[PDB]
Amino acid sequence: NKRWYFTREQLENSPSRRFGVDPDKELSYRQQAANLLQDMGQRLNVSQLTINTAIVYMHRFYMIQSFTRFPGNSVAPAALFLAAKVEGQPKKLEHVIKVAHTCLHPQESLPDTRSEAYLQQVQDLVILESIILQTLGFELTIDHPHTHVVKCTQLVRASKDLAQTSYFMATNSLHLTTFSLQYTPPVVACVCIHLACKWSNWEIPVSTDGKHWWEYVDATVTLELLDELTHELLQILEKTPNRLKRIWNWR
Amino acid sequence: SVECPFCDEVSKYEKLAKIGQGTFGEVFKARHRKTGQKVALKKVLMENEKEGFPITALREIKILQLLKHENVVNLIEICRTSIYLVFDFCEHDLAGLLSNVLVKFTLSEIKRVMQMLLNGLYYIHRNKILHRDMKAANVLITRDGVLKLADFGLARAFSNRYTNRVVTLWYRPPELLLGERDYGPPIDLWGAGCIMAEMWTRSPIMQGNTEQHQLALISQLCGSITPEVWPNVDNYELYEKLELVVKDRLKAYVRDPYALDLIDKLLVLDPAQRIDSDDALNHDFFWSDPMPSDLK
Numbered sequence: 174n175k176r177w178y179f180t181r182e183q184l185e186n187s188p189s190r191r192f193g194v195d196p197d198k199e200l201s202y203r204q205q206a207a208n209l210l211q212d213m214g215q216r217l218n219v220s221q222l223t224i225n226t227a228i229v230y231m232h233r234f235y236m237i238q239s240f241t242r243f244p245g246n247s248v249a250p251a252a253l254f255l256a257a258k259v260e261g262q263p264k265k266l267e268h269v270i271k272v273a274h275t276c277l278h279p280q281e282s283l284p285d286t287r288s289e290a291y292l293q294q295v296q297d298l299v300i301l302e303s304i305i306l307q308t309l310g311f312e313l314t315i316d317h318p319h320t321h322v323v324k325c326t327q328l329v330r331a332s333k334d335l336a337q338t339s340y341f342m343a344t345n346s347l348h349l350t351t352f353s354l355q356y357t358p359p360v361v362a363c364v365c366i367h368l369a370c371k372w373s374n375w376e377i378p379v380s381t382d383g384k385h386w387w388e389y390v391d392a393t394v395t396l397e398l399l400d401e402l403t404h405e406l407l408q409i410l411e412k413t414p415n416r417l418k419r420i421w422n423w424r
Numbered sequence: 425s426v427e428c429p430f431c432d433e434v435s436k437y438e439k440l441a442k443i444g445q446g447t448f449g450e451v452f453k454a455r456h457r458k459t460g461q462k463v464a465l466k467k468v469l470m471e472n473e474k475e476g477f478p479i480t481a482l483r484e485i486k487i488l489q490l491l492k493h494e495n496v497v498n499l500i501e502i503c504r505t506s507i508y509l510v511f512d513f514c515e516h517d518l519a520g521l522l523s524n525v526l527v528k529f530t531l532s533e534i535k536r537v538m539q540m541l542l543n544g545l546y547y548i549h550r551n552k553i554l555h556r557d558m559k560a561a562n563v564l565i566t567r568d569g570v571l572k573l574a575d576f577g578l579a580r581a582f583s584n585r586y587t588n589r590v591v592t593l594w595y596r597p598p599e600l601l602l603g604e605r606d607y608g609p610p611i612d613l614w615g616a617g618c619i620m621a622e623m624w625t626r627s628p629i630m631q632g633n634t635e636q637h638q639l640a641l642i643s644q645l646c647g648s649i650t651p652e653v654w655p656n657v658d659n660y661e662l663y664e665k666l667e668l669v670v671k672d673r674l675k676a677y678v679r680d681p682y683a684l685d686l687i688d689k690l691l692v693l694d695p696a697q698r699i700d701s702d703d704a705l706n707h708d709f710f711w712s713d714p715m716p717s718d719l720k
């Protein structure tokens with residue numbers, strides 16, 4: 174029930190930490206997996222929802238396994254392969270292998286689909302999907318912050334622009350933070366919308382009753398936690414080259 | 425060896441018997457090594473499967489994890505060593521009981537069955553799932569007399585280009601045979617119709633051999649398929665292949681007028697005029713003497 178939610182201290186004592194992997198290093202391995210997921214995903218022509226789902230698989234998977242044992246470059250393809258079947262956009266195993274390969278090795282060229290080397294890496298992926306399902310305890314139904322952002326942003330008539338920026342923050346929270354391991358999706362959504370508003374210099378007006386916009390999204394959410402969380406997300410956004418540029422007002 | 429906090433080895437359970445064959449492997453009765461709790465182990469095998477873990481099995485697992493209700497089979501967990509779906513064990517099944525001339529239902533009981541049935545449907549449709557395999561063989565009952573909707577291997581979610589060859593032939597509704605692909609919950613309710621009639625006749629009422637034979641056998645029970653009966657049934661393409669032109673056929677077996685009225689509202693040709701699980705639960709059948717009674 175609160176199985177896949179973790180404290181800051183459980184996030185410190187990760188499986189990766191046992192095997193020597195620095196905290197900061199781990200955060201990168203997560204971001205690189207996320208990146209590889211997004212790259213493979215756009216080429217494979219699956220939805221952002223599938224990529225998001227695969228990203229959460231990755232995130233959970235490394236709270237149980239270690240990066241020192243399962244490299245993100247091996248786990249990411251298999252996770253996306255699974256996620257695409259689970260999200261109803263199945264892609265063929267040969268197909269995910271071919272795309273995973275071109276992303277990891279733009280220069281090399283795919284082995285012979287007849288060889289013992291290609292026949293192997295197909296099995297490695299099939300074995301890894303199996304290891305992922307077992308690590309996740311077959312819990313494949315993932316709830317994403319986006320669902321809840323798109324709810325609220327309408328029920329406050331945000332500009333098309335503010336809504337897009339909220340979706341943006343949502344997706345980027347999956348690549349850049351471990352929020353999906355720490356906070357429920359509706360809360361993550363509030364963080365996304367709150368930061369989006371601060372960034373677009375948009376103020377959402379206190380509903381007629383006296384309640385703040387967020388209390389219509391999650392009873393637990395305080396403005397103290399919203400400010401703490403947007404600051405974290407904003408900071409990692411600023412460290413990430415070219416991201417903020419995408420939502421920046423150049424006018 | 426790799427850590428596995430959330431997927432227990434099936435050695436957990438002690439096997440007692442094969443009890444069926446699956447689409448990916450054998451089905452066993454089995455017993456918790458510690459508490460003796462009885463479960464059904466339904467194996468899933470990956471050899472003839474070329475795309476890794478079967479997408480079709482993932483769907484079932486996804487659906488079963490979502491549906492938690494008194495009248496729907498309970499998936500307890502998934503186990504490893506291959507992969508096994510672990511279910512709560514269910515002693516009987518509507519089909520087998522109907523086949524057994526030894527076993528006999530009162531009117532009071534048959535009502536209770538139809539009630540638990542219709543309530544399981546109310547639930548799964550309310551959760552945006554179509555069963556799609558309604559038939560007596562898929563209605564289970566436990567030792568304590570509780571009916572479980574079972575076997576969601578053909579089930580899918582809903583909200584309009586859905587697949588056509590679904591539901592075993594005898595239980596399949598007019599609209600699917602007429603080539604419909606924008607169907608909803610009513611296809612399951614047609615199935616509840618044939619299952620209900622089956623509760624007296626002891627025998628699947630409409631046994632076909634081909635799609636044109638079933639669709640004909642249907643007409644010689646529910647009347648010809650005409651736009652006067654089924655507004656805009658014309659629009660359907662396959663409607664140009666084998667034309668033709670119910671309470672009296674079942675009058676004999678059933679006798680009770682209420683039972684008969686409901687079965688007529690369930691076996692209605694126009695999917696939009698066919699009764700839903702909600703109105704059926706409310707139908708006089710469940711609310712007039714003798715009231716529905718528990719099972720022994």
Ligand SMILES: Nc1ncnc2c1ncn2[C@@H]1O[C@H](COP(=O)(O)OP(=O)(O)OP(=O)(O)O)[C@@H](O)[C@H]1O
Nearest residue numbers: 443444445446447451464511512513514515575577
């Ligand atoms: N939870 C359970 N408790 C008791 N028996 C069960 C349970 N689940 C399945 N069975 C038995 O297993 C047999 C077949 O199971 P299952 O429906 O999975 O395979 P199947 O024959 O392919 O089904 P279908 O043909 O409807 O897809 C049935 O005879 C049924 O009685």
Ligand SMILES: [Mg+2]
Nearest residue numbers: 444561562575
């Ligand atoms: Mg069966």
